[PDB]
A paper describes a structure:
We discovered the existence of non-canonical flagellar filaments in Achromobacter sp. MFA1 R437,38, a soil bacterium that was identified as a cell culture contaminant. Like the EHEC H7, the Achromobacter ODS is also formed by interactions between flagellins that are five, 11, and 27 subunits away. The key distinction is that all of the EHEC H7 Sn:Sn+27 dimers form at a single radius while the Achromobacter Sn:Sn+27 dimers occur at two different radii. This tetrameric symmetry is characterized by two 4-start helices that occur at different radii. A notable difference was the greater stability of the intermediate waveform in Achromobacter and wild-type EHEC H7 filaments compared to the FF mutant filaments, which underwent frequent polymorphisms.
The rotating flagellar filament primarily functions as a propeller, acting as an Archimedean screw, and supercoiling of the filament is essential as rotations of a straight filament do not generate thrust. Here, we show the atomic cryo-electron microscopy structures for flagellar filaments from enterohemorrhagic Escherichia coli O157:H7, enteropathogenic E. coli O127:H6, Achromobacter, and Sinorhizobium meliloti, where the outer domains dimerize or tetramerize to form either a sheath or a screw-like surface. A shared feature in all four structures is the formation of symmetrical homodimers between the outer domains of flagellin subunits, with one outer domain rotated 180° relative to the other. These symmetrical dimers are the result of outer domains being able to adopt either an “up” or “down” conformation.
Residue numbers in the entry:
A (entry chain n): 408 to 509
B (entry chain X): 510 to 558
C (entry chain f): 52 to 204
D (entry chain X), G (entry chain j), I (entry chain u): 2 to 51
E (entry chain f): 459 to 509
F (entry chain T): 52 to 153
H (entry chain n): 103 to 153
């Protein structure tokens, strides 16, 4: 399901698969400073081995722990409220059916 | 003169510190007592049954 | 349910913050001891800068300076809190997550109190004051008549 | 309300007791040490001046 | 040269270096004191919200 | 039937008014300590307005005041009551229906 | 707060009392001996000069 | 402020809680019907004659 | 009233104590120095005359 004709830039959908990024090896600093347009982005090696201008990666951790917990809370509360509403309606049906039986 | 300058900012005024400690102790005893009576506030509920 | 989660998560957040006060207290106490060390160093430095003292008394003064500096470095490398070298050269700022619904913290920004970072790093009144050099740079190598021979040779 | 599960009055009393105890603690520290400005959190600039 | 140290030779202005160290240490200490004040204020605020 | 509707709705309105009281309590409690923040800022402003303090100690006062302002902003952003940042930047006036007959 | 297993106020009071007693001991020793520079831990170069 | 080991203990407790949640899901049974489980279609509850 | 947070009597006593202490300090300074006009802040014209 991948496409070879059309690629995606770091931030955009570009047909040009290769850009030829220009990095300068800062002498006496041993850091591949950016040269093309970022002009000193201090390139770091990414987690996939490619060159990138970011300093910190995603890591291995729930990025939004409490937000996911709140989402779980919302799902559980929705189910509990639905069950409670069905239970109340069922009690009302019990009353109505008993009256109709009488 | 500089030692006096340091005293004016660093040394503690014992007269006000003693009074502050006394008021703090008074507030502590009062707080413990009122916290107790607040703890017997729900006791009156445990009368009707 | 929402109120229970919020109220008890806030109690836990209060616990976290209260640990933050303890961390800051420990670091502040260590810093106060460093402060006393600097005060004594300044006193005896004013003493030693007098010219009436012969060389050997300056040697004894420098011995005491070295002892104080070594203690400062010891405080730097040994002030511990929950196994964290808080007042050391490797101490990133803390977070202290306060309040539920994470996204808000309290950065501590505590680091770098020791010799070589208070700026002294070589403090000396007599001959024995050995300082620290810097790694030779390729620019310096070229500057002193550098002649290339290969891969950075 | 006549509920027993939570006692708001007790919680308020606990808060005021904690405030009074913190005041007592700082007063006792300043009384014992003889220095108003110790643990710089009180008058942070004052300790720099001192 | 190879060895990493050299003679210090009568550090030029001792008291100025000491005063710079004093400024750095006092700055960090004041930051910590401000953090302690903020943190106890947060303790009070959080306790109020808890009640 | 009309009496039951009125009494039940009015009791529920009493519950709603109690919720409003609690929300007002939370907001007032947060504001009560923002008040202490402002008091401390004013006291330290009086202290640092003196000329005897050199620039470094004025910087320390400014750092502490920056902490106080950041804490006030944190109070505004984080003060929550039933998923509503009541004392915040985006806080519209509430409704708090008391009584039946909308 | 209302904790009793540790009394932080007692600890700070004890530490300040220990500092006070150390100062008293130095003063008493200097008074009895009559020498400011005694126990070379006090004014190390001073005793060399003396 | 917590070092890695205490975080690991917290993670162990959280894993225990998650395992309990999964157990409750797989084992909450009612008349041989795992009602609160991963295979639970909505029921009917015929209430009245004239289906 | 019956208040405990503020004690006006204690504050008044502290102020009078401070005034008396200042008077005592001036008296001790005048005795020790032996000159009535020392620390010119008192009787500046007297200081100029002296």
């Amino acid at each position: 399901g991948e496409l070879t004709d059309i690629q995606t830039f770091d931030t955009s959908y570009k047909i040009n698969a290769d850009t030829g990024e220009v990095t300068v090896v800062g002498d006496n600093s041993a850091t591949a400073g950016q040269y093309a347009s970022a002009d000193g982005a201090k390139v770091l090696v990414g987690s996939d081995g490619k060159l990138t201008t970011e300093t910190t990666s995603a890591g291995d951790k729930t990025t939004d722990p409490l937000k996911t917990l709140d989402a779980a809370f919302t799902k559980l509360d929705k189910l509990t409220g639905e069950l409670g509403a069905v239970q109340n309606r069922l009690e009302s049906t019990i009353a109505n059916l008993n009256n109709v039986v009488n | 003169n500089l030692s006096s300058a340091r005293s004016r900012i660093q040394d503690a005024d014992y007269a006000t510190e003693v009074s502050n400690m006394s008021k703090a102790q008074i507030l502590q005893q009062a707080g413990t007592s009122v916290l107790a009576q607040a703890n017997q506030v729900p006791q009156t509920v445990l009368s009707l049954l | 349910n929402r109120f229970t989660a919020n109220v008890r998560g806030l109690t836990q957040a209060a616990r976290n913050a209260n640990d933050g006060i303890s961390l800051a207290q420990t670091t502040e106490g260590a810093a106060s001891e460093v402060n006393t060390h600097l005060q004594r160093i300044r006193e005896l430095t004013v003493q030693a800068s007098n010219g009436s003292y012969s060389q050997e008394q300056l040697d004894s003064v420098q011995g005491e300076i070295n002892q104080r500096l070594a203690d400062i470095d010891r405080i730097s490398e040994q002030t511990d809190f929950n196994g964290v070298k808080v007042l050391s050269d490797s101490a990133k700022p803390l977070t202290l997550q306060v309040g539920a619904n994470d996204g808000e913290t309290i950065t501590l920004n505590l680091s770098e109190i020791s010799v070589k970072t208070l700026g002294l790093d070589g403090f000396n009144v007599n001959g024995k004051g050995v300082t620290q050099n810097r790694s030779a740079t390729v620019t310096d190598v070229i500057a002193q008549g550098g002649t290339l021979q290969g891969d950075g040779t | 309300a006549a509920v027993i599960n939570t006692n708001y009055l007790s919680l308020v009393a606990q808060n005021n007791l904690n405030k009074s105890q913190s005041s007592l603690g700082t007063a006792i520290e300043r009384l014992s040490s003889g220095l108003r400005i110790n643990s710089a959190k009180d008058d942070a600039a004052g300790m720099a001046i001192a």
